[PDB]
Structures are given as structure tokens and as C-alpha cells.
Enzyme design. Structure first.
Site, mmCIF file in Angstrom:
data_model
loop_
_atom_site.group_PDB
_atom_site.id
_atom_site.type_symbol
_atom_site.label_atom_id
_atom_site.label_comp_id
_atom_site.label_asym_id
_atom_site.label_seq_id
_atom_site.Cartn_x
_atom_site.Cartn_y
_atom_site.Cartn_z
ATOM 1 N N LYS A 163 0.786 -1.245 0.000
ATOM 2 C CA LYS A 163 0.000 0.000 0.000
ATOM 3 C C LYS A 163 0.816 1.293 0.000
ATOM 4 O O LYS A 163 0.582 2.151 -0.860
ATOM 5 C CB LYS A 163 -0.960 0.038 1.185
ATOM 6 C CG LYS A 163 -1.784 -1.213 1.409
ATOM 7 C CD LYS A 163 -2.713 -1.069 2.617
ATOM 8 C CE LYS A 163 -1.964 -0.876 3.950
ATOM 9 N NZ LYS A 163 -1.219 -2.084 4.405
ATOM 10 N N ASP A 196 -1.295 5.456 10.565
ATOM 11 C CA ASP A 196 -0.034 5.132 11.264
ATOM 12 C C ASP A 196 0.869 6.345 11.416
ATOM 13 O O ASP A 196 1.502 6.498 12.463
ATOM 14 C CB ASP A 196 0.725 4.014 10.543
ATOM 15 C CG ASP A 196 0.030 2.668 10.652
ATOM 16 O OD1 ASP A 196 -0.175 2.184 11.790
ATOM 17 O OD2 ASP A 196 -0.305 2.091 9.596
ATOM 18 N N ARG A 240 9.869 -7.291 8.592
ATOM 19 C CA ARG A 240 9.380 -5.895 8.691
ATOM 20 C C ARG A 240 9.974 -5.055 9.816
ATOM 21 O O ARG A 240 9.833 -3.827 9.811
ATOM 22 C CB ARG A 240 7.849 -5.889 8.759
ATOM 23 C CG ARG A 240 7.145 -4.718 8.066
ATOM 24 C CD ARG A 240 7.303 -4.754 6.558
ATOM 25 N NE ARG A 240 6.394 -3.820 5.899
ATOM 26 C CZ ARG A 240 6.405 -3.548 4.596
ATOM 27 N NH1 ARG A 240 7.287 -4.129 3.783
ATOM 28 N NH2 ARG A 240 5.513 -2.704 4.102
ATOM 29 N N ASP A 280 -3.292 -35.727 6.640
ATOM 30 C CA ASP A 280 -2.163 -35.430 5.747
ATOM 31 C C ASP A 280 -1.183 -36.603 5.894
ATOM 32 O O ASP A 280 -1.215 -37.285 6.925
ATOM 33 C CB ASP A 280 -1.507 -34.137 6.202
ATOM 34 C CG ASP A 280 -0.520 -33.577 5.202
ATOM 35 O OD1 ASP A 280 0.541 -34.202 4.965
ATOM 36 O OD2 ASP A 280 -0.794 -32.473 4.691
HETATM 37 MG MG LIG Z 1 2.520 -32.947 6.532
#
Ligand SMILES: [Mg+2]
Ligand SMILES: [As]
Ligand SMILES: [As]
Ligand SMILES: [As]
Ligand SMILES: [As]
Ligand SMILES: [Mg+2]
Ligand SMILES: [Mg+2]
Ligand SMILES: [Mg+2]
Lengths: 300, 297, 296, 299
Positions: free
Chosen positions: C15, C35, C126, C165
Site C-alpha cells: 500500500k 499510522d 518488517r 495429511d
Molecule cells: Mg505434513
């Protein structure tokens, strides 16, 4: 076969920016830097926090050469090393040529010739990596020695002279100099104009110089005559010669006045002094051997 | 008279800040750092750009020892050197003691034991000098090995068990709200406790809520157990939680509850928790965790 | 027409970098940022020091609208203003549309849709402008609401199921890199997780197994012969990554969910390992139990 | 009542560092800054990127006063606001007193008087928040106007004079010099020739020095040594020589300004000053005396 590249240039000339981009585009090359080791052995955060000592500087020189020997002794993957220092001291450059000769490596030189005005502009915005202006001056002097650029030491046999500038020196500045419509007795700098007469009535030849373009394409000496009619008649300066910026010359005040010195002034007169205003021009006369008296704050 | 100080600590433990302040107040001491040489040989502008390879790491090890030998061979002016690395690998710490044994130098150790929660908080704000969370975990594991801190490997002979937390785990998150109803039950997790119990596992319930107040030291404990046993339907065999004036982090309280009351009586095979810091705790001490929700916090 | 451009995007979506480059290339545009005002009224050196208060956030909202009115109520030189905030709250976006309807200005929207994995990667580097991972999560949820992206709430009528999974979950790893093809034995089984699949299958659940391995179907049948025979998982279905699917584990498993799993089963739970995939199931409505440290 | 604190000081004088520490220690105070708004309306990452426009500076002034009215019109929780600008322009300081008189608020002034040499040293290391040296000079001039510090405009009736400096100017340098190595080979030819040329025109040569006058046991030992060089070995036709005292451990900067106002200014009409050291050259120029800097004197 392997290379030892030495970067030659004043702080702010672009040595580190190149070294980083060269190692990225050419694999097998490694960097060895003094400032990095100086800051590392003391664990400092800011580079200006460092204070020089013959003991500390000795350890740093040791780290440089020991790391160079170690890296260059590797496989054929190692193409060479870059010494990203200023390398402005002749004794340090010689030490690297003595070192390469003893082990069979090729020393290459990467010169970074950046103009004075640009180096000062970069050093003022450098922050914590900024160097004092007197050491930047001392380093540009060492850069001129390496580049082989000339230093004046006199011209025996020719008449003694003093160089005077018009730009803010003989002519008081308003505001970027004064207008050519405002050229009257109220634009005269009293103490400086009194000095030119005082020197002329003492055997000195007054040589007047200017950065103002001499004229237009149709009339090459338009402003030259309008400047000389002020210096000679309205100001009363007893000049023997007046050479100024050639018509159409777009170059910096810095280099134009140095060229005017070596071509027209230096071979005909024995210049003992230069009275100027603009900082970059004052810095120029001083480094090439001519003595300057800066008449006002001429920053720009 | 000549020391080789090795700093031991995870990235963000305060090693560089100390090394700088020590060299300033004690003249004659010099710093030798790995990260500084790694960034220097590649001419990088920040730490993050550095790509690890065995050939570059070999040159950096070389620069470390060659600089140490050179500095320490220099009269009564030099008092010693500081190696401001993490020094979490046992092979690297041994290499500095071998180097010291071979040239007669004293190896001193400066330990920086900073808690996990604080290390993560500092690493998130570290910027370009930030390390991946998996390597910060791998390093705190090496710090516990150095400190000699315990790792669980089972308790044979004792009955097999599964540890369950209350807040965030068996009880749903409201927004940790007021003390509850039958609608604050986490369906899938409570169903899991009833299934493990039926399989011959001992359900041990743990909690981070304070047991009581100054007048009644077991008030909130009874109101939590009446929920877990009656309203939730968890077949627990034991419930130990945070005592009276215990104002410590959820992190250390549950580890103490484990070693004192749970570990010597049960063979813990699993821990079902929610809060990230507690999940990280069970996993590093040897107990397996299943984090049931986002527990950041 | 005089514009009021609202930037919509999570912190780290680009942005501020756009707003700076837009004002440089398009003269007449001015920036209004939250900000910047938050940091200014407190005179802070960095934006992580700031403490949110009702009096302070009220003053900042005041500064935003008063500056917007002042800039736009000027010459024909003023083309419009950019509000470089996250604008992820629907009440704040509405307040700017109400403001444009009482003075006659046009509200334009500049969307910055950056993937989750990339937002986390940017937020970790950041520095002082870094936001807590729980607020970055809360904001990506608001970004999905704005984008109109789907959230699962069940599938009534179809059989109840639990998703499993393989790599990292039903099977152990080497550290940071899955097990080799012909090196899949009985010592690579994750005991407690495989025991869970058998538990759920007896509890009336359908075990749906999913994997992130490419897949011919040479690597698929190598994986299914492990899950069904060597592990002993009572699966009803196994859908995995295609032959040359060069995408992310993140998006591949979400696609496998909506196309093959969601319309056929009522998914009550997902057992996974990798952080990015765990974050994915949780934000789309499916409950996750992360079985190990899966950072990646 | 509520306060409106205006910080007065050149860039690098410590205004922002104080404002941050004051709001942390005293709750209820809010900051309003120009540089913050200038950078915000253009979305810049650095301060040196901003270009000065009159439509822009007008919007920034608007943001300052509108935010001040809004914050101060709050409850009894709001104690006041800090305007962390340089506030060196008299028209801007007046605008804040007109604003405070218009709404019944107390204007307070927080002055940050930091010496020139220190301001330049801080500005060279300021990085992207660094201001050009000509604007730092222009601002220290406005600081002297506010502080009420004197500016020379001449001394009519009294004889016309030129001020000269010893070390660096009339005498060549080493990088100071040792008192034993004071030959005729240590004279600066062109500058010493100038003192004779100016005396020939009717100017009174006033010599000044930043050197010590003597030790503890003998308070006037080095003064005799310096004058015996200037008068006899150099040949400068001086009428007066005043230099630094015995235990005067102060800066070359302030010592020479005091020597000017006490001993030189009331007795002579100073038209010029010939000096070397940058800080001293900067001093004569800002107080009204014209300078000719003879060499690189940085430092
Ligand atoms: Mg996995
Ligand atoms: As003229
Ligand atoms: As409860
Ligand atoms: As497998
Ligand atoms: As002398
Ligand atoms: Mg000039
Ligand atoms: Mg919990
Ligand atoms: Mg001097």
C-alpha cells in the site's frame, strides 16, 4: 592466474556498491574490507565510533593479508579477491603488489574518479559513515597524486600576479548571482575592490576571472564586454587581463576556472594569490597550489 | 592472563550488546564474530542476503582462528578475545578449547539464558537480523542441552496417559471469559478425551487458571473440576492446576506441574493443548503435542 | 470528479510503496495515513511503541477527515486524496462513502491481494513495523470477507469425516525434507497419529487422506500402498497433487478440498503438520490439530 | 488552563528527543510537527525528498492549527500540545500567540540554545534529515535574533581597523606550533604583507590570538613571546594585541567574541577580520564583521 582487485577512490566514490554488484554477477570473487574489520574487532554499531591506533590498525592489516592468502589458496572455484578500501596510500598499494609477486597473483586496479563537488554532496548525506571534511580533502589530494593531475609550484621569470573573481567577490551578491540590469555602484564590494587597487599599486598584475557565460550564439562576447565595462570603469579595478567562461561551455565552475588557469593565466603570470568566494572554486585553487582568501560564505 | 571468552546464547539473547559494552569498559579486549565475516566476504548490505555453503563457512572458520592467533600473540597490551557467536554447537566449543590447550589460553564462558517467550518476542522485531522460527527452536534445544535441562523419554511401569488442558482446549475461547455453561464445550476435543479413557489411557487434566483467592485457596479449582467432570463429561483421574500466589508465566508453571505431579506417576504419551508457548514447551521437553487451535497469546 | 482512493490490504501488501509512486507520477494527489498520525501525536521514534486508546484513535479519525475536507475543498489543482490505511473494517469503509455523499466526491478502491505465505514472509522481516501474527491472521480474514472468498460451515446430509495429511502427519520426517520413495518402512509411521485414524474409523468417521507429493500415477500408488497396507489407515479416499502441479501446498490442498472432499463429505476435522496448510484449514472454517512443529 | 508549548531551536538542537521524553513522562500532552506532515502528505520515506511548494506549505499550516484546535477542545484530560518545529520565523511564533489569545490558552517557550560548532557536527552525521549548511547558518542567525544576541554595524568616530589572527593566519601551521621553533621561515608571506599594506592605508592593525597567556607561576610568559614575534620577527605594525587569559579553558569561538566586544569594538571601527580557523571565521561573519579566510581551517 587469480586476481587481487584494489579499488582506488575517496569515501563516497562508489567502491562498496560496485564490489557487492561484482561478486553477485561474477561467482568465485570474495571481499576483504578494512572498515568491516575495524568495526568488527571493537563490536561497534556505528562506523564513526572508531578511534585509530597503531596496534588496532596492525591487527586489521594482519586480518587483510591472512584472509587473502587463505581464500586465494583454495580450489579453481576461487577466481580472486577484491580489497574494497580507499587504497590512497602508496605504501599500502605497494604492499599488495609485493604480496602478489611472492605468490603469483595478478593485481588489477579499479579507479573511481568522482568530482569534488559530488563527493562533498554525498559525504554530507552519508550519516554515521561520514568522514570529516579535512580528511575528505586529504584524500582527494591523494587521488590527484594517483591520477597524476598537476599541482602548481610557481612560474619563474614571469610577472607576479593576484587572481580576482567577480562572482560574489568583486561584486556583492543578491539572493544565484546579481542581475546585469542592477550593475551600478551599489553592487561593488568595498573592501575587496580596495584590495585590487592596493595590489596594482605594488607591482602586482590584476587578473580578473569569471564564471558567467561570455555571450550568445549570435554575439559570442555580449556579457564579456558588459562585465569588463563594470570591472574597469564602474569598479575601478586596474586589470591587465580578463578571461571568462567560453560561449556555450556547459561544464562546472570548478573545472572551467582550472582550465582558464592552466591555459591563459599560469604560463604568462607568476600567481601568488587568488581572491574568490564560491566554496568549490576556493577548494580548487587551494588543492592545485594557489593560495586562497575566501571573502564570504560561498556555499552554492 | 589471556582469555578466550565464548558467548553462549540464542540469537536475540543479548550477546552483541554485552560484547560492545565489555570492550568499552575493559581495554585490551577484541571481538571476533561469525556473522560480521559472513556479511563481509560477500559484501552484503544486510544479514538476510547470506546463503550458507560449506566452502564459505570454511573460510569464515579460518578467519576466526587466524585472527584469534594474531591478536593473542601481542604482548601485555591484549587482555584477550571475545567470540560473540551463538556457540551452541558442541564441536565448535570443543575446537576453541583444543586451540586454547595447544597455545595455553584460558577459555571462559559467558552464558545468556533468556526465556523462550522473550526470545520469540525479540526475534519478531529483529527485522533483517531475524532468524526463521524453526532455527530459533533448534537453537533453544541446543541451549537446553548446554544448560543440562531435562528431556522426557517416558516413565515405564507407570500407566499410559494423555494430558489435556482446559482453557482453549476442552473449553472454547470466548473472545477466556467468566466462570461457564454447556455451550462453552469444544465438541471434537472433549470427544477425544472420552475415547482415550475408554482405550486404557489415564486422562490427566491441567489448567492455567488460579486455584483460588486469599480467603478460599481452592475456590476456582472446584468450579473448574465440576465443569470438567460433570458438565463436559471428561473421565479424569487427576487434575492439578496453578496454586495460590503463583504469578509466573503459563510456560514454567505447567512444566513444574509436569515434573512434580505428572511425570513420576504416569507414562505420558501425548499432550493436547492450545496456547503456543505451552505447546512449544511440551514439544521441546520430549512430550508430543497436538495444538487444537490458533493460540497466539 | 474529485477522488477519494481507499487502499484495501493487510500490512505488508504494498500500500505505502504504491501511494508514494502514484503521488510522484500523478500531481495533485495527497496522502492521509493513520499510522503516520498515530506516530506523530505521540512523537514516537518507531511504531511498535504505540498504545491504542479510545481518546487517541478518536483524535486520529478526526485528523483524517478534517485533512480530507481541507485538501479537497481547494483549487482545481487538487485531483484527489489517497487513504493509505488497511481499510479492512467495514464501518470505516462506509464512513468514507458517507463522507463522499455529503459533499459529492467519488470513492475508488485499490485492492492489494497478496497471498498468505508471502504476507508472513514480509512481516517477519518488517522489523519495528511488524504486526503480531494473530493480528495479521485477523486481517487476512477481513481481506477474505471483502474479496468475498468462501468459508465452510458444514455439509448436512453427507457422511461425517476427518482429513489426514501424509508427510509430517501420518508419516515422520527427516527434519526439513520428506522421506525418500523406496525408504518408506514401518519405522517412519507416526504412532499416535496413525492410532487416531483407526480410532475415528471405528467411531463412524470416513478417513480422507490428502498429500502434497506429485503423482503417471507411480508416486500415488507408492503412497497409497503405504497408507493402506504398511500403516493400516482405513481410508475411503485419497486425493493428492497432480503430475506437474508446480503451485503451493497452500492452494493445492484448498482446491482438493472444494472440488473432491467438500461436496461428498461433512468434514468435522483436519489433522495436519505444515504451518501454512494448518493456517489454511483454520481460516476457511475447518478445525485443525497441528501434530508437530511444521515451519517449512 | 491548557498550554501550547513552542520549541525554539535549529535542526539538531534536541527538540524531537525532548518532545518524545516529555509526552512519555507527562500524560495528556500531544505533538504537532511540520516535518511529519510534510513527509506524510507526499508519502515520502526520507525528509530530503520533500520539495517546498506554497500550496503544500499552506496545507501543512492548516493541518497544524486544525489539529491543535481539535486536541485542545477536548476534556480536562488534555493538558496541552507541543509544536516541535524550529519556530525560528517571528511571523509563525506570532500566529500561535494570536491563536492562543483567540481561545484562552497559555503559550510557553522551550528554548534549545546549542553552540554553532556542535550544531554543524550533529548536522554532518544527521544523514537524510541533514539540512544544507547555508540553511543551518540562516537558522542560527534567526536563533541569535530570538536570543537577542548582538550584531556589529560599525563604531563611528573611532579609528578604522582590521583584525588579524596569529596562529594559522600570520604564522604557518603544522597541522599549532612549538614556542621554540619561531623563525622567519614560519611567517605567512602574503598575509604579513597585507598587514603592512593595510597600515599604509591608515588602518589600525589589531592582532588577536587564541593562545595561552602564561602558566600558573608566571601569568604573562607566552604573551611576551608571541608579541616579540609579531612586532620584531614578522614586522606587523600593531597598535594593540589582546589574547586568551591564563585559566581560560573555553572555546576559541567564544573567547574571541568576548575579546571583540570588551577590548576591540568600543575603541575601533572594525571594517575587516583576517582569520584561518573555520569556527572563528563563521563567528566574525554572523556578528557583522567581514572575513577573509586565508587557508583551510577545519579544526
Ligand atoms: Mg505434513
Ligand atoms: As557585474
Ligand atoms: As471452564
Ligand atoms: As510415504
Ligand atoms: As610564533
Ligand atoms: Mg565567486
Ligand atoms: Mg489451553
Ligand atoms: Mg588561527
Amino acid at each position: 592466474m587469480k586476481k587481487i582487485i584494489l579499488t582506488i577512490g575517496c569515501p563516497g566514490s562508489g567502491k562498496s556498491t560496485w564490489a557487492r554488484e561484482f561478486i553477485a554477477k561474477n561467482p568465485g570473487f570474495y571481499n576483504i574490507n578494512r572498515d568491516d574489520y575495524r568495526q568488527s574487532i571493537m563490536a561497534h554499531e556505528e562506523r564513526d565510533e572508531y578511534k585509530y591506533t597503531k596496534k588496532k590498525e596492525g591487527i586489521v592489516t594482519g586480518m587483510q593479508f591472512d584472509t587473502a592468502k587463505s581464500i586465494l589458496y583454495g580450489g579453481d572455484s576461487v577466481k580472486g579477491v577484491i580489497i574494497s578500501d580507499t587504497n590512497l596510500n602508496p605504501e599500502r598499494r605497494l604492499a599488495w603488489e609485493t604480496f602478489a609477486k611472492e605468490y603469483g597473483w595478478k593485481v588489477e586496479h579499479k579507479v573511481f574518479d568522482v568530482p569534488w563537488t559530488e563527493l562533498v554532496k554525498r559525504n554530507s548525506k552519508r550519516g554515521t559513515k561520514a568522514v570529516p571534511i579535512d580528511v575528505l580533502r586529504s584524500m582527494y589530494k591523494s587521488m590527484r597524486e594517483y591520477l597524476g593531475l598537476p599541482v602548481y609550484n610557481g612560474t619563474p621569470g614571469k610577472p607576479k600576479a593576484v587572481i580576482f573573481d567577480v562572482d560574489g567577490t568583486l561584486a556583492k551578491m543578491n539572493g544565484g548571482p546579481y542581475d546585469l540590469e542592477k550593475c551600478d555602484t551599489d553592487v561593488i564590494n568595498p573592501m575587496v575592490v580596495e584590495l585590487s587597487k592596493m595590489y596594482a599599486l605594488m607591482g602586482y598584475q590584476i587578473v580578473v576571472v569569471s564564471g558567467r557565460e561570455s555571450g550568445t550564439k549570435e554575439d559570442p562576447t555580449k556579457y564579456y564586454r558588459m562585465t569588463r565595462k563594470w570591472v574597469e570603469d564602474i569598479a575601478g579595478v586596474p586589470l591587465v587581463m580578463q578571461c571568462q567562461r567560453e560561449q556555450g561551455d556547459t561544464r562546472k565552475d570548478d573545472v572551467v576556472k582550472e582550465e582558464i588557469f592552466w591555459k591563459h593565466i599560469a604560463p604568462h603570470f607568476d600567481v601568488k594569490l587568488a581572491i574568490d568566494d564560491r566554496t568549490q572554486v576556493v577548494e580548487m585553487w587551494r588543492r592545485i597550489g594557489v593560495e586562497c582568501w575566501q571573502v564570504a560564505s560561498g556555499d552554492f
